[PDB]
Design a protein around this ligand. Sequence first.
Ligand code: SF4
Ligand code: SF4
Ligand code: FES
Ligand code: FES
Ligand SMILES: [C-]#N
Ligand SMILES: [C-]#N
Ligand SMILES: [Fe+2]
Ligand SMILES: [Fe+2]
Lengths: 635, 635
Amino acid sequence: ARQNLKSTDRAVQQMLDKAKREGIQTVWDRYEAMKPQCGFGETGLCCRHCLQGPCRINPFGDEPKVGICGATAEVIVARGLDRSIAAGAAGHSGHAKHLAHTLKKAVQGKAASYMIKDRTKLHSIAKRLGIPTEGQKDEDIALEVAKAALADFHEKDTPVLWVTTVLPPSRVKVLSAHGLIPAGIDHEIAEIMHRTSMGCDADAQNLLLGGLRCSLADLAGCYMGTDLADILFGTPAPVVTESNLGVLKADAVNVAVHGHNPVLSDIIVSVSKEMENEARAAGATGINVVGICCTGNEVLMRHGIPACTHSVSQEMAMITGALDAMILDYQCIQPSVATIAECTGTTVITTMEMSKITGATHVNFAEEAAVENAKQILRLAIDTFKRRKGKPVEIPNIKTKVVAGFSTEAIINALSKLNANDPLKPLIDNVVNGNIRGVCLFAGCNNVKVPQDQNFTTIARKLLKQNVLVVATGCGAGALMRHGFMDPANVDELCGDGLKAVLTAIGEANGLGGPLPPVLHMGSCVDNSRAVALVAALANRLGVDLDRLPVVASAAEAMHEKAVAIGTWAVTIGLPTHIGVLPPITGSLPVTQILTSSVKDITGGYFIVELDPETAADKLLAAINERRAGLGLPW
Amino acid sequence: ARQNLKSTDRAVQQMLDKAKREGIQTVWDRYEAMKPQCGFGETGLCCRHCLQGPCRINPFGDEPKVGICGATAEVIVARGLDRSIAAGAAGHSGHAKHLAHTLKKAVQGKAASYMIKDRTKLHSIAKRLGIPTEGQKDEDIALEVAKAALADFHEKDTPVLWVTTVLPPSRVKVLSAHGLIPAGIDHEIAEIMHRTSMGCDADAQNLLLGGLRCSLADLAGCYMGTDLADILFGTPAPVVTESNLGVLKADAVNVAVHGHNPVLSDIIVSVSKEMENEARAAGATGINVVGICCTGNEVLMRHGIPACTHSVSQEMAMITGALDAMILDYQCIQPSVATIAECTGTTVITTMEMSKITGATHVNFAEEAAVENAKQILRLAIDTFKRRKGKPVEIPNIKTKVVAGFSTEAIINALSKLNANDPLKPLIDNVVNGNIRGVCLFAGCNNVKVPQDQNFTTIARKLLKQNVLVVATGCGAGALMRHGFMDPANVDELCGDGLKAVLTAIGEANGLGGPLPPVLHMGSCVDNSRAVALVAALANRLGVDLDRLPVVASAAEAMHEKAVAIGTWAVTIGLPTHIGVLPPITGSLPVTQILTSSVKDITGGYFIVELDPETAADKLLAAINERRAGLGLPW
Ligand code: SF4
Ligand code: SF4
Ligand code: FES
Ligand code: FES
Ligand SMILES: [C-]#N
Ligand SMILES: [C-]#N
Ligand SMILES: [Fe+2]
Ligand SMILES: [Fe+2]
């Protein structure tokens, strides 16, 4: 087996060879077993929205040409996509909702493991929302912020504040004019499910305008999730750590935190440190907590917990034979982990009521009991460590250095060292003079269809050479960090001369004796919202709307419904947005034309669907340069 | 073409022959063009929940055996079903939400076309909810009831009151114990979408318990919708009208009201009466408003508007060439109507923002402007009538007499004529003595897979002969009414001797000089909730829970996601529930076993999946008789 065709990560390749020796089936094996995949589903031309179905439409040829109810290709494709957006919105905003409840519990005195850690963030959010702070206790301001967050999930006398208060007013006005401002987060999710059900909305434009609106409900959930997590757990600032499977340690209790919401795993980090002497008792050096996927990102950003792996290669951490526990919340967890555990010895633990996996051990996490849960979980891990006394392990000796923690506040602080009272100005100055060509946000998943990380690294390398300021989140940040893009030692090799000068100037002003890393890690997938905050602050400072800025986004290897939602609100807020896998839209040319062209006329943004990464990088550069030309700037 | 293989309705058959002459494609033609349908989708063994897909699992044989992420057949089947329930819940509860807003507008003075028509219903709902009425104005009690309705869509300090206040406390306690009581209607819809998204819930039992909970959010939306529609438009009482295509009149302006929410179509009924002289001016006799689907049911129940047709045969009304307008809200409208209109001359009009159809004319209905909208719409219809001056039409001369309007209040009133102060007792007495064997609720759609009405009539005929009290809603009521089951003249032919004696005793006590009809029409699909109210009142009166009563349900020809949701809450509240088409569950034996067997242990109810209607009738009789035996009654 040529393992480079599966993953470009060498640690992953090493574990693919071990899995193949050992007979352990992987995601890649399960993909091969699926080929050829259904061409109706690939093109979007399948509907199962009622029990007359399943319906399909031939992309070309003869009948069937139309759904049994009369639904055209246009309708079928748009309804499918809409439901994917709604599903993504449900995940991000479910995460946010859970943190809103957690904050309320904290400040009501019902969960003393949680607290207001970032009081400055709390007060700033309150002021953005219009919540009064003067003469109020912190707990009462917090209570009010949690109330406001929960209120945005339903209809009320205002629209969703975690949209209307986070974008420029001019953007809010353009979106309002088209009826795109969500009325309530769960309200919009529900309306999508209604309108896409049989015999309801059957006009592609109408359907896709609803999808745009629902993508803003997803944005709101993202931003809410970042705001509340920062209050509770601290706003990230720059941190130095490591990534890839080599961060596992044979002589330690290796515990992965995996999923998205870090509400327990932020506690598992703090508790694990207390339980060092109990680990040594069991003959370990200590507990080694490592991250997978976005819960990993969260604790990497705030605590510098090393990232073990991401997305499509998550099973490989188990294949080492050194992963004593994998502690799961929700989202992006291949349920194969529960069966692979039988072979590898790993204790897989679920913790959220609505996210269980057959064959995994469940712990009923509650905030009020967060410490005692953590200790129970870590004591299963220590027991699992002891069970592999005298078992050889194969941990690839492969890791990278990672500098991360670039929240928007952190980036503004860093810039402030160059201009204390106008911190955005040094960035704008260098956009204007061409040292920075523009900004690209890498976001989203890996996808088994694409050799792991190949699109992120191929595109990022072309953009960096062309002096684009590259920011990343989620498993796009994961890809980039595991390939060295977060190590400032690689700035000379990766970055154009203009970008290098800027990264160096900022880093030297921040006392580093060198540069910021090539790529700025802005956090988890909800922390795509931090990129919004940065770009909206730029917009405000420039007195223009986001669809005039030289800012693009790339979901270069997208997988999840969440990633579809994020791509869609990136287009809705005015960004040219690349997707590097085919969404199920090609079976309708009119819907494709809306999403890739005529939506420009509505929001200013638009999808760029391009599976060849070299070609995608050129198209993203063209988009950036078109924005530069619109502002009258050289390019 | 043998048209009896498509529909058992002779009017439909006549219009199928006309469509075939004229070259007009129908739903049946589009079905034939779809065959053979995809066997993955038929069995549920297809997933498109991420961009790694589409995934499928062979029902039998060799690979693929598992989804690319590891998702088993069990998981894939349960997630698909869950999303169908959520979609149904979104439709019913979207309808309810819209009526909650309408009521608020009414009583705030913002829409003087709407008002509190049923003050007794208002006050009773307020008292059920715990809303105080003593010394309060009607408008303020209404405002409070609308507030409460909207509050049930989100989390709060109570659970969904339109569940917990409408079921027996013992049923609420059984459901609470299993964690099945919804926390908020849109909250549950969103949580379903989250938990079924990639990498989240992956345990069939956990997934299906969430589905049960979400089906109760659907119940809540149903019940809310019936409550609010009764306040605004009046609670139904017995009414005499007609059904089938013969209710169209060549010399009149024929206007169909079609969809579900009647918020404008209740106004179109009242306004149409005012516009008689304007119709005569255009050379019509007057405006003839007729119903299709559940908006038709709503205005049949309250106003005795004749029902033209239902569900799968809706296009046939157009094929007559006499349907001048079809006025659409949302749900269950084959979008083919917009194209068939080009051929037939019919003006198809949409009226709801989130439900448009390419090629239809849109009118932006607003409550504040309800009368002026109605007149605009009716004036398009009159213009269309004039355009078919001297055009032969083919209206099959085929209609039935329909007695309907059996709300729960109406049924209780009717019974009260036999026992004024214990109105349920005469019904219970006749269950106990075997005159009434049990109760069956027919519900749900027609489905092109099943020759139209064949399952409803075949099953109903066997049950009626066995003295079952048969109640119906939606297009199950439609089926039954078009085949004569709502004409009391057919009681001798259709009903067993015990049922006939009861229907006759009630009818004679109500001054009729004969019987109630064979089948009691309890209204639209949301008015399945009325059957819940009746069965819960019986439960309360008997001091037992619903899963001990001899009450079953049959969705004999189900189609819509809404129908899946209704079937699922019928099982959740404790009913043996027949479905006469295959839901996409057969690809997982463990999920099938849960839904058809082990769910009994949780809720007392269970699905009966049976495509042969004779066999289904025997299984439904067996279920009824098993309940009789449990109560110690002969059978
Ligand atoms: S909604 Fe229409 S296209 Fe979809 S499965 Fe049902 S009949 Fe087919
Ligand atoms: S969620 Fe799993 S089974 Fe479904 S499409 Fe994605 S990889 Fe396939
Ligand atoms: S026909 Fe394959 S995705 Fe439905
Ligand atoms: S493979 Fe046909 S429904 Fe997906
Ligand atoms: C990722 N959300
Ligand atoms: C039907 N609902
Ligand atoms: Fe993520
Ligand atoms: Fe209906």
